[PDB]
């Protein structure tokens, strides 16, 4: 009922959304634009914003430390770009995150003698990305998608769900099918649906 | 000595560059920006351009028909965006490509009763993307990268090479290691290098 929120920025948000969304402890994901000053970001109209991701996670299952580790492994900001704006950003929500981040950045910068160009700033506003970016890899496979969209009875219902992130994670080649079968039963849906959902899945 | 060139656009060019670059018959890849009118595209300054990819392929091994099939499977442009600009574009270089494309688009639009919003226009200019986008997933793994960068004796030498595309393809989870071992010997480099290159590879 009460969870924790991380807001990261690491280039295109498709990869992340399908990566984080396949990690255990990750409850939900939304991709969007954060870091800028305009009130109207869109995919080709960022202004000063950056392609970002908001991860709703359970601190009892996954730490902000683990997340930061994934964050700096999913990309390499060890090059100076930082052109016009910043591709690599960490948006902290409380001082807890701000200090772990400022510390872990200091760790790699020391353990590698190589300056990391990740920005650590306070989250001012996260602007939600257009619907065709939400659970991208999932939305592409249109049969699995339209099936799940019905089961959850709405677009928004699906993309907030943990299961979509896992599916979208699996399709992107970021999940062993066995783990998907687990996350599938954790919903406990009527067997007709299950088999049908699982049906599209075994045909790969 | 003489090859064929396809120029596609399908969203972020990282995925593609690592996908196409792992298909047999694909000689080289460059990511960049095409489709616009400004003479100065960059990652956050596209103008009217779109994130594009240029694939140098061998028509004796792979057809433009096969490429177009990969192109329309790697993404789903069956949604109307097409916002401000066009994410999904096919840049033809000769009438051969223009007709296969205009035909294959007509095929799916019929076989699915669903309008594809891919643009088919003549290639006017392909602007090369910044170096940190070239063989992205490869450049991230900094040991394998700096090793290969030395073997090829230059940055540009590596990214034009077939092997980098295959490596960058493998790292992105788009290649069975066995196929990488093949593409590795097709270069016939001194065994000290081989084993060292293969060494970083088995540690995954």
Number of domains of chain A: 1
Shape of chain A: globular
Strand-residue proportion of chain A: 15-25%
Q: How much helix is in the residues of chain A?
A: 40-55%
Overall CATH class of chain A: Alpha Beta
Most extensive chain contact?
A-B, 24 and 24 residues
Tell me the quaternary state.
Answer: homodimer
Q: CATH H-level name of chain A... which superfamily?
A: Peptide methionine sulphoxide reductase MsrA
Label the CATH architecture of chain A.
Answer: 2-Layer Sandwich
| Lateral arrangement of strands in the main beta sheet of chain A | 5-4-1-3-2-6
Largest sheet of chain A: 6 strands, mixed
Within the CATH hierarchy, at the fold level, what is the topology of chain A? Peptide Methionine Sulfoxide Reductase, Chain A
Give the termini distance of chain A in whole angstroms: 36 Å
Q: Can you write the helix and strand succession of chain A as a string?
A: EHEEHEHEEHHHHHH
Which structural class best describes the helix and strand composition of chain A? alpha+beta
The radius of gyration over CA of chain A amounts to 18 Å
Tell me how many strands of chain A there are: 6
Catalytic activity (chains A, B): [thioredoxin]-disulfide + L-methionine + H2O = L-methionine (S)-S-oxide + [thioredoxin]-dithiol; L-methionyl-[protein] + [thioredoxin]-disulfide + H2O = L-methionyl-(S)-S-oxide-[protein] + [thioredoxin]-dithiol
EC number (chains A, B): 1.8.4.11
Family (chains A, B): Belongs to the MsrA Met sulfoxide reductase family.
Protein name (chains A, B): Peptide methionine sulfoxide reductase MsrA
């Amino acid at each position: 009922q009460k969870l924790s929120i991380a807001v990261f920025a690491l280039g295109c948000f498709w990869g992340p959304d399908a990566q984080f969304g396949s990690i255990k402890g990750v409850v939900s994901t939304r991709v969007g634009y954060a870091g800028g000053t305009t009130n109207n970001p869109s995919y080709y109209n960022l202004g000063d914003h950056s392609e970002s991701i908001e991860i709703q996670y359970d601190a009892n299952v996954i730490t902000y430390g683990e997340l930061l580790n994934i964050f700096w492994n999913l990309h390499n900001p060890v090059y100076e770009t930082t052109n016009r704006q910043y591709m690599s950003r960490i948006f902290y929500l409380d001082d807890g995150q701000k200090s772990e981040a400022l510390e872990m950045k200091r760790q790699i910068e020391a353990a590698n003698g190589e300056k990391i160009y990740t920005e650590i700033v306070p989250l001012e506003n996260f602007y939600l990305a257009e619907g065709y970016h939400q659970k991208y890899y999932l939305q592409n496979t249109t049969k699995l998608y339209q099936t799940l969209k019905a089961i959850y009875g709405g677009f928004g219902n699906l993309v907030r769900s943990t299961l979509a992130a896992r599916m979208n994670g699996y399709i992107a080649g970021n999940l062993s099918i066995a783990s998907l079968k687990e996350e599938m039963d954790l919903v406990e849906l009527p067997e007709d649906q299950y088999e049908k959902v699982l049906s599209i899945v075994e045909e790969i």
